[PDB]
Amino acid sequence: CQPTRFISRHNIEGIFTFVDHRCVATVGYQPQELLGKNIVEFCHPEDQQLLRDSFQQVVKLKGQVLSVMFRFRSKNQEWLWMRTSSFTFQNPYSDEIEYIICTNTNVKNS
Amino acid sequence: FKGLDSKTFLSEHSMDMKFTYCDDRITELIGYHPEELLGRSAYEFYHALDSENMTKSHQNLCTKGQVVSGQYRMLAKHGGYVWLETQGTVIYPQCIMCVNYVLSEIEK
Numbered sequence A: 001c002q003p004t005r006f007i008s009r010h011n012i013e014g015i016f017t018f019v020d021h022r023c024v025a026t027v028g029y030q031p032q033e034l035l036g037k038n039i040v041e042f043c044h045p046e047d048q049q050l051l052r053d054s055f056q057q058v059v060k061l062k063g064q065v066l067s068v069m070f071r072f073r074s075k076n077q078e079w080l081w082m083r084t085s086s087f088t089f090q091n092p093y094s095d096e097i098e099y100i101i102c103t104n105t106n107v108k109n110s
Numbered sequence B: 001f002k003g004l005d006s007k008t009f010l011s012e013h014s015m016d017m018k019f020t021y022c023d024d025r026i027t028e029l030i031g032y033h034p035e036e037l038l039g040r041s042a043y044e045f046y047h048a049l050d051s052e053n054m055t056k057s058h059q060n061l062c063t064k065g066q067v068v069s070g071q072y073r074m075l076a077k078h079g080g081y082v083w084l085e086t087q088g089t090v091i092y093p094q095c096i097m098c099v100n101y102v103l104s105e106i107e108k
């Protein structure tokens, strides 16, 4: 059974700058509904600071993966457990600012 | 001349290198529609002269969890090859996430 997941790209602040259409099946929103918003806008109040802090640290970790579990508000306003695996990228031919690549999977908290 | 964003595309793969996702940036670059790539192994697209090296990089990626490929050639949809470099990352294994950047025009 394939896990349900989608890829996203974020600026270092956490704003969605790209969203894979598999988001509709995963969390119920169209890409347009996510683009331009901070991931933290979709995050459970108890988990928001952890997510901020995760985004802050992933840029320090030399491009290694940082994982975070958090509750994501679906299009139906229900809290879905997500495991987001995130890493930085920047084109080595450039000095343009790093951005963050996430794979976001709906997982069990059990 | 193309900007940086326009020369990069993201792909996702199963552990066997079969495409499970590819962003649409590949179309302008290499000609493929993402939907025609799904279920096809990345190996189907490597130049013969890069195949042994890509096998080794795949091995490194699976062993270590991350890899930067050497420069390699990907077969283009309408013939010829484009030079690429890829940063690969295993997501735990669940799948492989690739950041692919084009290093050349299509060469025939």
Ligand SMILES: O=[N+]([O-])c1cc(C(F)(F)F)ccc1NCc1ccsc1
Residues within 6 Å of the ligand: B011, B013, B016, B017, B018, B042, B043, B045, B046, B054, B055, B057, B058, B059, B061, B067, B068, B069, B070, B074, B086, B087, B088, B096, B098, B100
């Ligand atoms: O999909 N891969 O498993 C993969 C691995 C490697 C590396 F050699 F670094 F391990 C590089 C690229 C890909 N996938 C992307 C791709 C594969 C053929 S054309 C674009």
